[PDB]
């Protein structure tokens, strides 16, 4: 599928879930605590920054520091980053990260078929901190893979991958060339790993 | 099928999607990325050279340091190789590999009596680019056969349908209606070379 369309108001969830990267997407797993690809946070050290929710320049959840960097020691490109609680910048709710964005919760499981949307900041270059959602059935889910015909670009790298209820069912990784997309489903093993990382 | 000519301009598409090994064929899947066979990467290691879609007399998409080699788990001949982004010797589109190569896309699929072409270097002699003509006979898992005629140059080549969409990519021959075999790419294929293009 190809059905991307441009978020108005990023302000409210399941949008105040995402994050922004310079280019490229991650999601909020709980307290001070965003999910991205390895790929993503290779690049990133401890006191660079991430805007929470921002619609282009016209407002956003705050602007925070990274305190912390871990990647799952597995083959699966997933890291979890840690921010300082107290903004650089405020968000509309003050100062604290946790009053400016909402983790979002596991689904019980995801099956071929049935409709996923992948939310995130697709343009690596052009439309700079503009959130898109982008719609597709899932083609397969075996093991720590989920599959989704859902049109993205590169800046999705770290979206997260949600079911028709706003429940997490993957974090996005890759695409085809010019009709498959690629995410991380979460299995125990992984979903254990994230777990033990989330600030406490 | 025995229907092999010569590429007459090796720097459009779909030949920019095009590389060459010693005496082997690759192609382009993603950013810094090309697949080859197995059994051709096996002689090569990291550090070693690739050149991108090259014509009969010097002139070529740049020279590229190998800097990964990842073999497929799997019975089937499929190797990733990822090179630096930045060629040891520039292209006409500058340093930056991705600037002078044209990934291919996937088929929706490939199915029995659809006509293919198979693009590389059946003759060691200078790289010159074929391309060999040839329906499809069978598609079976991650088997594709088609009756296109190759040499041993031809490893690693990638099987175009008539829409220069991947297909499968060439790893054997028989020893014309001899047939020829590719690697089909199914779901568990496409998800390891998805998990290890660069990014």
Same mark, same amino acid.
């Given at each position: 599928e190809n059905n991307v369309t441009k978020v108005k108001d990023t302000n409210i969830f399941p949008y105040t879930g995402v994050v922004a990267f310079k280019s490229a997407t991650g999601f909020v797993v709980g307290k001070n605590t965003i999910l991205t690809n390895k790929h993503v946070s290779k690049n990133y050290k401890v006191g660079d920054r991430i805007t929470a929710h921002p619609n282009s320049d016209k407002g956003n959840?705050?602007?925070?520091?990274?305190?912390?960097?871990?990647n799952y020691p597995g083959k699966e490109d997933v890291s979890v980053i840690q921010v300082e609680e107290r903004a650089i910048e405020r968000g509309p709710k003050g100062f604290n990260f946790n009053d400016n964005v909402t983790?979002? #919760?596991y689904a019980a499981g995801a099956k071929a078929g049935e409709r996923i949307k992948v939310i995130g900041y697709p343009h690596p270059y052009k439309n700079k901190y503009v959130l898109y959602e982008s719609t597709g059935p899932v083609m397969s889910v075996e093991g720590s893979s989920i599959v989704y015909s859902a049109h993205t670009e590169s800046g999705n790298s770290g979206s997260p991958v949600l079911n028709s209820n706003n429940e997490l069912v993957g974090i996005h990784f890759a695409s085809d060339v010019k009709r498959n997309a690629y995410g991380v489903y979460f299995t125990p093993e992984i979903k254990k790993f994230?777990?033990?990382?989330?600030? #406490?």
């Open positions: 959840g705050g602007i925070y520091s990274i305190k912390k960097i871990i983790p979002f #919760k994230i777990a033990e990382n989330i600030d #406490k």
